[PDB]
Write a protein that binds this ligand. Structure first.
Ligand SMILES: [Cl-]
Ligand SMILES: [Zn+2]
Ligand SMILES: [Zn+2]
Length: 847
């Protein structure tokens, strides 16, 4: 076949359209009474007296009821010419022949495009086409002269019969001969497999097949016209009134060079017509015909090829669903082409609705297209569409809206194949539409990621312009990943909205891309940790960029909405390094700042402290803007940074301590004071930073380090105050001997206090007034406790008489109390120095 059959189908199609069934002569029925027992042509009902009057055709001579005249199937002219042939009245035979010629000329004249189309579809020359045409014209004029055929009908089985059971048997009548099969009892899907033979010399002796339930009940019938018989047929017929019946017919006519059934011929015609209008004419594009709407899928071409397939199918008994199911199997070969997925989805939806009182899968087993054929086809098409979607971004760019439509409609066709499996083939299908599409999108994402990971620089440099010596590659890669996820979020998600609660293209994109990029980045940083050939600033910016990505696209995904992020672990060592370098820079800035402050003259606090804390706060700003979500790691950062702060401020304290015993001389009296003020300033702003780092929320180790540091600082300030008080010891000794000389003069009370205190009064007013101006609270009080200590120490080393010293003692007590600005009396009274001096006085205070 394919060469012999192709030609046979060519001939039969020509003959099928040169005289179409659309322009057929209508019978002319007049009331008729049968004088002898006749039987109706359709229902075979009896015709007799005036009580059973029928109708008669004045040209055919066919006999039927009034209620049956419309249900006939037999060309009027062909029947007439056949009758004249049975007889011999040749005059009318030729007359009718002439009228047939005329009605074929009419057709060739009116619609000549059809026959040239047939010519080109089968690639037949003009000459041979005219000869073969000329031949079929005459074959139409011979509907009896050269027709006879031995028929062999094997009744195989039936299905879905209407009864709660039945005992069906089949009767097969040709012309006068009538036979029947065995009876199967209690079976609505029986099997006969009975063979019969028939002679069909006539032409209007149709093969009547009727199924009865064992007068008997009527279960259905199929009438097989003679025009629809070739070679060896195996056909399911729907019973007319209910189920179907399967017949295996074989025909022999005369010279039938092994003709093939008209189903096979039809698939040939449809395949070649498709392969013509698609490839040869449109060069490849599958022209999509009109639609709208209830009978859209019922149309395949325009009024120029639709006529060919339809007239071929009607005049040879090919059912509509066979047409549709062959056309689908043709489109399947052109599913990739634009606009086809849609019509294939609708077409399959109708093939699906046509098959959904017998099961659905078994009913579908009755389709003559092919039990396994159609399901194998559908399987190949499904397994093909998933391959086509596994590269959807490449095969369906977001650019062309039409291509995006072909994507949406491809997913629709896939859902329709599955739906066909769930409502027709009948079975549980683990391949669920949404989940299969999901799998395909995942595969496409993997391919895409590997593609941008193999062409990072090329693509980046093409649009926005891995190494151990450089990190630019990762910045570019992140940028391109953002591009991909943004395209999946902007274009492909609105298009693939077939499954809103199970397929959010954007979120799958985000998740997959992040996972791949995450294991890649992780490995890369684990590699960089051993080597470390780049700047800490670079690792920092990369930490910042990965952060931005995760927070922008992944953090809010259900899979990663549940804490904790994993990426900050990749970077912890590098930021540790950055903290070391930062520490070193901060020390060098401390030294450099204290040189400007010394060289300037130390102009209530100076500028070096706010400079140091400005530096440290610049450093801390970076750690705070990292917004690290892993609590243990951020706690690690604070743990490491507390050490930085501690060593910095201790460095300050040690430097000033080195230069303290040098500015205390009787020269600069503002400088030491403002230095101690600076230490105190460290003491106050440290706490501000302590709460800036969390406060009590801070880690245990770090918090411990900072408070221990606080202790240390306080101790430093104490030591400093001590050293500063020692600066005045000689002057105080002078005052104590100067008052010691007047101490002996007094002899026989209130005025004497002033005369004895005058030497130290200069110190009291002159110094406690100067410190009151440029000293901090804590600073001043420290100096006061120390100075007091040293006063009591000195007045116990050099030295009416008795009362004077005690009253003066109270006077000094009040002067150091300074009313309410200096020390508190509660301390002065229970002071260890005061009671020591009083105890010393008790030895002489006897008179
Ligand atoms: Cl073929
Ligand atoms: Zn008629
Ligand atoms: Zn009738």
């Amino acid at each position: 076949n394919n060469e012999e059959l192709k030609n046979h189908v060519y001939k039969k199609t020509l003959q099928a359209l040169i005289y179409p069934i659309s322009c057929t002569t209508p019978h002319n029925f007049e009331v008729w009474t049968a004088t002898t027992p006749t039987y109706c042509y359709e229902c075979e009902g009896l015709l007799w007296g005036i009580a059973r009057q029928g109708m008669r055709c004045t040209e055919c001579g066919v006999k039927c009821h009034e209620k049956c005249q419309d249900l006939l199937n037999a060309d009027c002219l062909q029947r007439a010419a056949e009758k004249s042939s049975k007889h011999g009245a040749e005059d009318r035979t030729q007359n009718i022949i002439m009228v047939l010629k005329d009605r074929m000329k009419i057709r060739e004249r009116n619609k000549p495009e059809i026959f040239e189309l047939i010519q080109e579809v089968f690639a037949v020359t003009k000459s041979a086409h005219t000869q073969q045409m000329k031949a079929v014209k005459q074959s139409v004029l011979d509907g009896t002269s050269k027709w006879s055929a031995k028929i062999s009908i094997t009744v195989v089985c039936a299905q879905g019969l209407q009864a709660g059971s039945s005992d069906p048997y089949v009767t097969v009548q040709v012309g006068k001969t009538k036979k029947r099969t065995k009876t199967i009892y209690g079976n609505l899907n029986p099997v006969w497999e009975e063979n019969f033979h028939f002679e069909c010399h006539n032409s209007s002796d149709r093969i009547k097949v009727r199924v009865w339930d064992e007068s008997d009940d009527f279960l259905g019938q199929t009438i097989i016209e003679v025009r629809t018989l070739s070679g060896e047929m195996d056909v399911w017929y729907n019973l007319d009134k209910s189920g179907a019946i399967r017949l295996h017919i074989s025909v022999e006519i005369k010279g039938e060079e092994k003709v093939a059934p008209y189903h096979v011929q039809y698939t040939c015609l449809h395949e070649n017509l498709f392969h013509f209008v698609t490839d040869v004419q449109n060069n490849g594009v599958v022209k999509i015909p009109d639609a709208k709407g209830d009978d859209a899928w019922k149309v395949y071409y325009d009024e120029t090829a639709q006529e060919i397939v339809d007239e071929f199918a009607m005049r040879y008994g090919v059912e509509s669903i066979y047409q549709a199911m062959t056309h689908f199997a043709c489109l399947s070969s052109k599913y990739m082409c634009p606009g086809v997925p849609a019509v294939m989805s609708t077409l399959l939806a109708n093939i699906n609705a046509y098959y959904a009182n017998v099961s659905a899968s078994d009913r579908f087993a009755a389709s003559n297209f092919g039990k396994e054929r159609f399901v194998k086809l559908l399987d190949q098409l499904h397994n093909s569409l998933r391959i086509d979607l596994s590269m959807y971004r490449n095969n369906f760019p977001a650019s062309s809206p039409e291509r995006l439509q072909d994507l949406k409609s491809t997913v629709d066709l896939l859902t329709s194949i599955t739906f066909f499996r769930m409502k027709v083939q009948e079975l549980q299908s683990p391949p669920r539409a949404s989940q299969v599409v999901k799998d395909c999108v995942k595969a496409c994402l993997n391919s895409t990621y590997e593609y941008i990971f193999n062409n990072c620089h090329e693509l980046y440099g093409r649009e926005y312009q891995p190494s151990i010596k450089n990190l630019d590659f990762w910045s570019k890669l992140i940028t391109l990943i953002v591009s991909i996820i943004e395209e999946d979020k902007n274009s492909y998600t609105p298009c693939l909205n077939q499954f809103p609660q199970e397929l959010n293209v954007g979120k799958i994109s985000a998740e997959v891309m992040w996972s791949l990029f995450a294991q890649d980045m992780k490995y890369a940083m684990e590699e960089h940790d051993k080597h470390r050939l780049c700047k800490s600033a670079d690792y920092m910016n990369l930490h910042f960029k990965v952060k931005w990505l995760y927070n922008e696209y992944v953090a809010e995904l259900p899979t990663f909405k549940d804490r904790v992020p994993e990426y900050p672990a990749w970077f912890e060592p590098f930021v540790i390094q950055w903290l070391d370098e930062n520490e070193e820079v901060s020390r060098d800035f401390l030294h450099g700042a204290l040189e400007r402050d010394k060289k300037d003259g130390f102009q209530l606090f100076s500028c070096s402290v706010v400079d140091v804390f400005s530096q440290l706060n610049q450093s801390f700003e970076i750690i705070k803007k990292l917004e690290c979500p892993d609590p243990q790691i951020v706690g690690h950062y604070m743990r490491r940074f507390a050490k930085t702060i501690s060593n910095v401020l201790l460095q300050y304290a040690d430097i000033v301590s080195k230069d303290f015993a040098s500015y205390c001389s009787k020269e600069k009296e503002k400088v030491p004071c403002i230095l101690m003020n600076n230490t105190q300033q460290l003491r106050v702003q440290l706490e501000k930073m302590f709460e800036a780092m969390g406060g009590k929320e801070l880690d245990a180790e770090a918090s411990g380090t900072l408070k221990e540091l606080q202790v240390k600082l306080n101790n430093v300030l104490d030591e400093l105050s001590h050293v500063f008080a020692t600066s005045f010891q000689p002057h105080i000794e002078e005052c104590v001997r100067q008052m010691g000389d007047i101490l002996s003069q007094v002899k026989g009370v209130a005025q004497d206090a002033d005369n004895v205190l005058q030497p130290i009064m200069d110190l009291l007013d002159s110094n406690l007034t100067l410190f009151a101006k440029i000293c901090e609270k804590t600073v001043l009080k420290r100096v006061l406790k120390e100075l007091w200590k040293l006063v009591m120490n000195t007045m116990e080393r050099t030295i009416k008489q008795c009362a004077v010293v005690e009253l003066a003692l109270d006077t000094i007590k009040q002067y150091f109390h300074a009313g309410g600005v200096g020390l508190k009396k509660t301390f002065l009274e229970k002071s260890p120095d005061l009671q020591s001096l009083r105890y010393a006085l008790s030895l002489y205070t006897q008179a």
